[PDB]
Amino acid sequence: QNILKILEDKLSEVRDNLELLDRADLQRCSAIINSIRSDCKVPLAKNRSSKKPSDIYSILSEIVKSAS
Amino acid sequence: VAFKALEEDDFLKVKQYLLKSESLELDYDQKINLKYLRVKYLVKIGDYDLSMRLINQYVKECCEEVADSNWRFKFEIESINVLLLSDVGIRSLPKIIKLIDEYKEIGNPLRCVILLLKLCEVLIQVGKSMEAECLISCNLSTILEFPFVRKKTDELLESLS
Amino acid sequence: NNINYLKDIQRWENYYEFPLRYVPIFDVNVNDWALELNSLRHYLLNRNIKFKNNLRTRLDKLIMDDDFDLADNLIQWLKSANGSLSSTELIVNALYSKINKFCEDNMSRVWNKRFMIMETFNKFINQYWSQFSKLVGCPEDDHELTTTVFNCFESNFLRIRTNEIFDICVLAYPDSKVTLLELRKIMKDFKDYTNIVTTFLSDFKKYILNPSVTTVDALLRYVKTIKAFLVLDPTGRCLHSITT
Amino acid sequence: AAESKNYSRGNTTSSQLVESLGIQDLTMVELDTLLSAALTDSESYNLGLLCSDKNSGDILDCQLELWYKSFGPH
Amino acid sequence: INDYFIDYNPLFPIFATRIAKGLAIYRVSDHARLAVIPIRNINLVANYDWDTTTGKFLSIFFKDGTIRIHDIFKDGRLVSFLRIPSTKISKGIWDRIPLRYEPNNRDFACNIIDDLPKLIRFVKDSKRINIVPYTQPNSLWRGPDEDDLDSNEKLDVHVVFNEGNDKITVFFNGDYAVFLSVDNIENENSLKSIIKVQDGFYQCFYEDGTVQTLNLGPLLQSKSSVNLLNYIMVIKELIGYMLTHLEFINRELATPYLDFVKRLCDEAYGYGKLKSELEALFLLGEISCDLEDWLCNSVGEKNFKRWKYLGCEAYQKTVQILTLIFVPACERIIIYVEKLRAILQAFSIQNKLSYTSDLTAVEVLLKSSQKLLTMTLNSIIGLGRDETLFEKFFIWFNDRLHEALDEDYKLKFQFEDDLYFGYDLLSYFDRILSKKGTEPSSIIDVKLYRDLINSMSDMEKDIAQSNVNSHIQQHILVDLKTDVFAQKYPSSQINLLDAIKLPKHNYIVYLIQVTKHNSAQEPFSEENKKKLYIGTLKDENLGIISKESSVKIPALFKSYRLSSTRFVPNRVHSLLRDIGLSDSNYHSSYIRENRENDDFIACTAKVSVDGRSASLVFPKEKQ
């Protein structure tokens, strides 16, 4: 595990068999490259955006306003 | 019925149902429940090498095939339970804490409390039950509001005595 | 379990090494005695949380009362121990606390001066920078550390001015006009403006919008803030927000 | 400075909580639980292997913990 | 202004003065009237207290048991009216305690009420029915002040003392009341003054020198206990919140629609004859001479549009109040009682106290509220079917009515659109024209709703009295009355006059009348002198600090009641300068109102307590 922790620092070149690490970007780049060599899942990262709860009437008025 | 049979320790009934599972044509929502039912049954039997290899496969495909977060959590806590039940719960510490602060922002009180019990259960098998009692005492008021965790909560209280 | 303070470990070290002078067993060329000492220090750091917290408080107190020599000995002890409390975090926190208190002592309610942030920074550097560099061990001419220290000084200056902006604009105006123009050089983000107004409304409405206050003085102070913020903000958008 | 900007705009984060609990070291806590009792020979060689690791982290902590268990007060 | 009254606001330069027409408010700087509080009789007012935390409001205590609070800033406008059940008030003190719930990692008690959208009220003006955001009845004087950047929620505690019996009543948040019974009822000692040390810590000083201490500290330091206090207040309010709207639909939506139906049908034609005739009209089209009169003269065009307008609002507005009000409220009742049950169960284990409070009261409320939510959903589905039956009735009734009045109407609607059209049309007749339909509960079962809500409200008072009061009283400690002055003065009968706390200082300044106890062996000594000794006690343990010095009364001032003196803080010297600087009828030499009015003494007793001094005023009540 410590040996792999060392590999979490100096490895930045995409040198195959990335799945045993925990770095997604290197895995995603490897997946992108492996697809191009083959010619394969460009999984887009969903933006986890995040506040007042307001009242019932403000919500209902909002939906009918956006309805039109 | 099978979930009720699992609670009543009717292992013969649930075992025969799981045989039907592998050769039925099931909807996805029905698939996960039987997929989740198989994990809980295997924990009861005692075999954990098969279950551990089985549960992580489920959650991994529960984040790629379908982005179902609710079923990711329920599978995840089962991985915590099988670990700490095998007297090795320390490995779960990075995983549980990552979920605690993540679900604090969400604000779902059930998610926070169930993680507290797993955290408390971990702390009492290390030899540090003193602070676990201190932590459970301060939060005892807010953990009784949830009925289905009361049985696990009450059982833990007699252990501390 | 009986260790709670640094002075305890030093006297125990002297207790252990008392026979060492009378019987030489440790070779000069191998620092063997130091190795187990650092090993025992490392374990004490990584096993006794109460000792770790006491060391934090002791170093914070020592850096607060300007006992620099003992603080340096403590930093040397921590570095030799190589525990999970590295000295880099401690000196950062100690430096941050010291600069905050020095800023609070010096630039509190003083607005007549011009370019006073330079005066404060130079005074602090002449008083403590050589000692701090000795504590860290970095060269005295570390340019980027001085730049970051200056950036923290102006951030502290901004924070203090945001807190005191009500008395700044209501009472000292127009004597505090000069530092208002200097404040104009610093504010760059919309959050800074929204914080400056929401605080200023909060105090003004707290104090001035009392009907128990005479209406003539309320208006006189009000227009005093209007011109003060107008000079501060040429656009006048904050004036519109205040007026509304 | 960046943290203070958010703070201006303490034991509030979970990292301080796990620090307060004194369970920061994963391996040291795990071996402390394992050594609680015994010391079967098959396990003891495995623990000794951990002390004699070619590359690891808090190796000195495990060595002296093993020494405390073997020849400490009891 | 010369008067022995007036209490200065600690936070603003404003005072409350007493005049004949009522309580009056004048700015210190300008001597200009600011507000007038209409009061009938001064004797009924036990005392008035200012707002310590904010100073925007003012409190008035009545002897009969009513508390009235008016804000100064709104020209003395009344803002709230309070009542305490069957309590005789002697002297009350108002305190506002701000709570500080800093975020802690060990606190996993997340809140979801904030998350759930806030409720809305239903209020109908003369023009139409409007809908406004929901505000609690006492939230107007408790809402987060626009002024307070520290908008932390403030606990509102009103402390009430009963005369003649020394009973202590503490009032929380304007709704919940807690009764505390004092053991020392042997002596009927009048309570002289109330001094507040810090938030939730009070010292009571009686005429006999005994000191009684009320401490809110344990209650304030228990996070769950305060939440318990807040929850039981919310549950009672929301139950009445539903009950308020339940009477709204019965009075505004249900009854006006049914009365219009009754007057138009029963008073004109009759029910039993109408139902049979309408079915004959529906099946055969036979319109009798009398019924054609009913269509033309009784109903006509004018009432038909009103009938549709009244009916449509009777159903479409009724479903809105069931879904937008009752369902969100009943869910919120369930969440609160569930939290109510959890808190009591925990302290039944956490304290491990021998006496236990039974939880059957909570369980009954849980099922009753659960019964309501199932029962409201049945109605909403039921009113859904009513709207379908409602519309199909009038689309056909439009056709018959105009045909009777036009003799050339072209029938636009066709019965062939729907196959079961007859069954829905007939089913409406039975609902609207029947013995059960004649009752006002035809639209919804109002009686069942009214009974169920009152069942919960009456039971809700039981849980508060039986369990919540038991828990709050245990966490409330009332220090036994003790004598502190006996150690310094063990052979003197002590008479206490007044005592206050100097702000930013932890010392208690008191004025006492020391009369040495004359034994049965010293006959008729002239040393029965009333000495106005003044000393200092540390606010916490009431420890004597400085040696008391007896103030020498000049012979000219011996004709005044020294017992009626009170403390006057906050720069009384300011008025002395302004009296001579204002061309009023008040002369300072002694502050005298003309040459023909009562003279009141302003004893500016410079009691140098660590370099600072207070001020006193000596009233005139000639013996």
SS (H, E, C) chain B: CHHHHHHCCCHHHHHHHHHHHCCCCCCHHHHHHHHHHHHHHHHHHCCCHHHHHHHHHHHHHHHHCCCCHHHHHHHHHHHHHHHHHCCCCHHHHHHHHHHHHHHHHHCCHHHHHHHHHHHHHHHHCCCCHHHHHHHHHHCHHHHCCCCCCHHHHHHHHHHHC
Helix, strand, or coil (residue E213): strand
D14 at E interface, C-beta within 8 A: yes
Helix axes B129-138, B109-124, angle to 10 degrees: 160
Is the separation of the CB atoms in C160 and C108 below 8 Å?
yes
Asked if E150 is an interface residue toward chain C (Cβ–Cβ < 8 A), one would say: no
Long-range contact pairs involving E192-197 (C-beta distance under 8 Å, separation at least 24): E192/E496, E192/E497, E192/E498, E192/E499, E193/E498, E193/E499, E193/E500, E193/E566, E193/E567, E194/E91, E194/E93, E194/E159, E195/E499, E195/E500, E195/E501, E195/E508, E196/E52, E196/E93, E196/E95, E196/E501, E197/E501, E197/E539, E197/E540
Q: Do E342 and B109 touch (CB under 8 A)?
A: no
Phi and psi at E128, nearest 5°, equal -145, -175
Give the closest residue to B117 by CA, choosing from B86, B159, B63. B159
Which residues of chain C make contact with E34, given a CB cutoff of 8 A? 211-212
Q: E-chain residues within 8 Å CB-CB of A53?
A: 114-118
Residues of A in contact with E119 (CB under 8 A): 55-56
User: In terms of Cα–Cα distance, which of C128, C121, C190, C180 is closest to C152?
Assistant: C121
Calpha distance B123→B133 (Å, rounded): 10
Backbone angles phi, psi at E93, to 5 degrees: -125, 135
CA C161 to CA C168: how far, in whole Å? Answer: 8
Q: In chain E, what residues touch B104 (CB-CB under 8 Å)?
A: 108, 110
User: What DSSP element (H or E) covers E394?
Assistant: helix E360-406
The continuous run of DSSP H or E covering E384 comes out as helix E360-406
**DSSP assigned state of E525:** -
Instruction: Give dist(CA E396, CA E413) in Å, integer.
Output: 8
Which ranges constitute the DSSP H helices of E407-477?
Answer: 421-432, 435-438, 446-463, 469-475
Residue C41 corresponds to which amino acid? R
- Coil, helix or strand at residue E373: helix
Q: Are E620 and E560 in contact (CB under 8 A)?
A: yes
Tell me if D14 and E105 make a contact (CB, 8 A cut-off): yes
CA pair distance C24, E107, nearest whole angstrom? 57
E393 contacts E315 by C-beta, under 8 angstroms: no
- Whether residue A43 lies within 8 A of chain B, CB to CB, comes out as yes
Whether the CB-CB separation of E537 and E508 falls below 8 Å is answered with yes
* A3 interaction partners in chain D (CB closer than 8 Å): 55
Contact E82, E160 (CB under 8 A): no
The CA distance from B112 to E119, in Å, is: 27
* Site from D6, D7, D12 to mutate, E interface, most E CB atoms within 10 angstroms: D12
Sheet with E91-98, side-by-side order of all strands = E91-98, E154-162, E167-172, E176-180
Assigned token pair, C178:
């000069």
Residues in chain C closer than 8 A to D28 (CB atoms) = 46-47
3-class DSSP state for residue E516? strand
Chain C residues within an 8 Å CB radius of E147: 202, 205-206, 209
- Please report, in angstroms and rounded to a whole number, the separation of the first and last CA atoms in chain B: 35
Q: Are strands E201-206 and E211-215 parallel, antiparallel or unpaired?
A: antiparallel
Alpha helices in E249-359 (DSSP H): 255-265, 271-283, 289-293, 300-321, 327-350
Q: Which two tokens stand for residue C239?
A: 């004036």
Shortest CA gap A50–chain B (Å): 10
Measured between beta carbons, which residues in chain C are less than 8 angstroms from residue D10?
Answer: none
D56 to chain A: which residues are within 8 Å by CB?
Answer: 2
C194 in contact with E, Cβ within 8 Å: no
Classify residue E348 as left (phi > 0), alpha (psi -120 to 50) or beta: alpha
Report the alpha-carbon distance of residue B62 to residue B56 in Å, rounded: 9
Experimental structure resolution, Å: 3.5
Among candidates E35, E85, E87, which has minimal Cα distance to E56?
A: E35
- Indicate yes or no: CB of A50 within 8 angstroms of CB of B64: no
- Among the listed residues E481, E615, E477, E616, the one whose alpha carbon sits nearest the alpha carbon of residue E205: E481
Distance CA(E440)–CA(C64), nearest Å, equals 80
Residues E79, E58: contact at Cβ < 8 Å?
no
Q: What is the DSSP letter of A44?
A: P
Quick check: E147 and C211 CB within 8 A?
no
Residues of D in contact with E104 (CB under 8 A): 11-12
Helical (H) or strand (E) element with C70? helix C68-81
Burial (CB < 10 A; 0-12, 13-18, 19+), residue E115, is: exposed
Q: Are E325 and E122 in contact (CB under 8 A)?
A: yes
B37 neighbors B2 (Cβ within 8 angstroms)? yes
Please state, in angstroms and as integers, the Cα–Cα distance from residue E374 to each residue in E326, E327, E330, E336, E370, following that order. 11, 10, 10, 18, 7
Contact C205 E149 (CB under 8 A): no
| Cα gap E47→E62, rounded to integer Å | 8
Instruction: Compare all CA atoms of chain E with the CA of A53 and give the residue at the minimum distance.
Output: E117
- Do residues E192 and E206 make contact, with C-beta atoms less than 8 angstroms apart? yes
CA C124 to chain centre: 12
C106/E495 Cα distance (integer angstroms): 53
Distance CA C60, CA C95 (A): 9
Q: How many CB atoms lie within 10 A of CB B63?
A: 15
Say how far apart CA E573 and CA E567 lie, in whole Å. 14
Q: Provide the chain D residues 52-71 that lie in CB contact (below 8 A) with chain A.
A: 55-57
Q: Which two tokens stand for residue E283?
A: 């099946």
User: Rounded distance, CA E285 to CA E213, Å?
Assistant: 87
At B10, give phi and psi (nearest 5°). -95, 70
Cis peptide before C211 (omega within 30 of 0): no
Core vs surface per residue E476-496: b (16+ CB within 10 A) or e: bebeebeebbeeebeebebbb
Test D20 with C49 for CB contact under 8 angstroms.
yes
Phi, psi (5° rounding) for residue E242?
A: -65, -40
Q: C7 phi and psi, to 5 degrees? A: -55, -30
Check if the beta carbon of residue C12 is closer than 8 Å to that of residue C28: no
Could you identify the residue written with the tokens 């993540």? Answer: B102
CA C155 to chain centre: 11
Q: What span, in angstroms and rounded, lies between the C-alpha atoms of C71 and C135?
A: 8
3+ Cβ–Cβ pairs closer than 8 Å linking C and E: yes
Phi then psi dihedrals of residue E617, to 5 deg:
-130, 130
Radius of gyration of chain E (CA): 35
| Residue D16 near chain C (CB below 8 Å) | no
Query: What is the SS3 assignment for E543?
Result: coil
Q: Are E291 and E269 in contact (CB under 8 A)?
A: yes
Which of E12, E147, E149 lies closest to C212 in CB terms? E12
Experimental method reported for this structure: cryo-EM
The CA distance from E623 to E619, in Å, is 12
Asked if the Cβ–Cβ distance from B64 to A43 is below 8 Å, we say yes
CB atoms within 10 A of CB E546: 14
Residue from E383, E57, E119 nearest E245 by CA: E119
> What DSSP designation does A23 have?
-
**Alpha-carbon distances, residue A7 vs A13, A14, A21, A33, A34 (angstroms):** 11, 12, 8, 21, 21
Q: Could you tell me which residues come within 8 angstroms of residue A27 by beta carbon, excluding any fewer than 6 positions away?
A: A18, A19, A21
What 3-state DSSP class applies to E538? strand
Chains contacting chain A through 3 or more C-beta pairs under 8 A = B, D, E
Of the candidates E47, E51, E86, E41, the residue with the CA atom closest to the CA atom of residue E65: E86
E599: enclosing H helix or E strand: strand E599-600
Token duo for residue E216: 């809110």
Contact E43, E55 (CB under 8 A): no
CA atoms of C60 and C71, how far apart (whole Å): 9
CB atoms within 10 A of CB E338: 16
B144-149, Cβ contacts within 8 angstroms, sequence gap of 24 or more: B144/E341, B144/E342, B144/E345, B144/E346, B145/B109, B145/E338, B145/E339, B145/E341, B145/E342, B146/B109, B146/B110, B146/B113, B149/B110, B149/B113, B149/B114, B149/B117
CB–CB contact C148 D58 (8 Å): no
E154's enclosing H/E stretch is strand E154-162
Instruction: Report the C-alpha gap between B12 and B22 in whole angstroms.
Output: 17
Ordered strands of the E7-8 beta sheet: E7-8, E14-19, E22-27, E33-38
Tokens of C52: 């770790």
Query: In sequence order, what DSSP letters do the residues of C162-218 get, joined into one string?
Result: HHHHHHHHHTSTTTTHHHHHHHHHH--SHHHHHHHHHHHHHHHHHHTT-TTS-HHHH
Q: Write the DSSP symbol of residue E417.
A: G
Tally Cβ neighbours within 10 Å of residue E88: 17
Q: List, in sequence order, every residue forming a beta bridge with E82; answer none if it has no partner.
A: E67
> Residue E324 has what DSSP assignment?
I
Q: Is the Cβ–Cβ distance between E202 and E419 less than 8 Å?
A: no
Q: Which residues of E touch C162 (CB under 8 A)?
A: none
E496, E205 Cβ separation under 8 angstroms: yes
DSSP bridge pairs for E38: E22
Which pairs from A28-32 meet CB under 8 Å and 24+ separation?
none
Shortest CA distance from D59: residue in chain A: A2
As a whole number of angstroms, the distance between CA E37 and CA E21 comes to 9
Cα E442 to the chain's mean position, in Å?
A: 36
Contact exists between E and A (3 or more beta carbon pairs < 8 Å):
yes
User: Which DSSP category does E117 fall into?
Assistant: P
| Contact residues, A window 2-31, toward D, CB-based 8 Å cutoff | 2-3, 6
Contact between E248 and E254 under an 8 Å Cβ cutoff? The reply is no
Q: Number of residue pairs across A and B with CB atoms under 8 Å?
A: 3
- In sequence order, the β-bridge partners of residue B134 are none
Nearest by CB to residue B107, choosing from E112, E343, E345, is E112
Distance from the first to the final alpha carbon of chain A: 58
Give the neighbor-by-neighbor strand order of the sheet with E507-516.
Answer: E492-501, E507-516, E534-538
CA-to-CA distance for B67 and B76, rounded, in angstroms? Answer: 14
- Residue C124: its H or E element: helix C116-124
> What does each C-alpha distance from C118 to C115, C140, C148, C149, C153 come to in angstroms?
6, 19, 14, 12, 9
Question: What are the distances in angstroms from CA E21 to CA E4, E77, E568?
Answer: 17, 16, 23
Residue type, E230: N
